[PDB]
């Protein structure tokens, strides 16, 4: 137990994947679909309304106009009324 044989140095065994990978951990590209055609969406953009069923609530960090997750949509009859008494319908 005094000695520690089999030092087993690791050099190119970790370089073999690439050198910038051992300084920066790289990024994950999304999966490409077919019905989506060629619109390569990323993981930090959403310009359409989503559905909030058993999903997570997204967060925003700066600028970059985004869509939303619809929680309630309803149509009723538009009653006549303003912020006052002027209610002419002639």
């Amino acid at each position: 137990g005094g000695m520690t044989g089999v030092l087993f140095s690791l050099g190119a065994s970790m370089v073999l994947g690439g050198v910038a990978q051992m300084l920066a951990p790289k990024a994950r590209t999304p999966r490409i679909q077919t019905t989506d055609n060629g619109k390569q969406n990323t993981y930090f953009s959403s310009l359409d309304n989503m559905v909030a069923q058993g999903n997570v609530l997204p967060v925003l960090y700066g600028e970059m106009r985004v869509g939303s997750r619809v929680v309630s949509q309803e149509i009723s009859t538009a009653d006549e009324g303003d912020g006052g008494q002027v209610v002419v319908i002639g």
């Binding site: 520690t4 030092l7 140095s9 690791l10 970790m14 050198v19 051992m22 300084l23």
Partner: peptide, 17 residues
């Protein structure tokens, strides 16, 4: 230095670029 390794023989293994 990136990778540093310890051992009970009391020495260090340094992997560096």
């Amino acid at each position: 230095v990136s990778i540093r390794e310890n051992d009970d023989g009391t020495y260090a293994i340094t992997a560096v670029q």
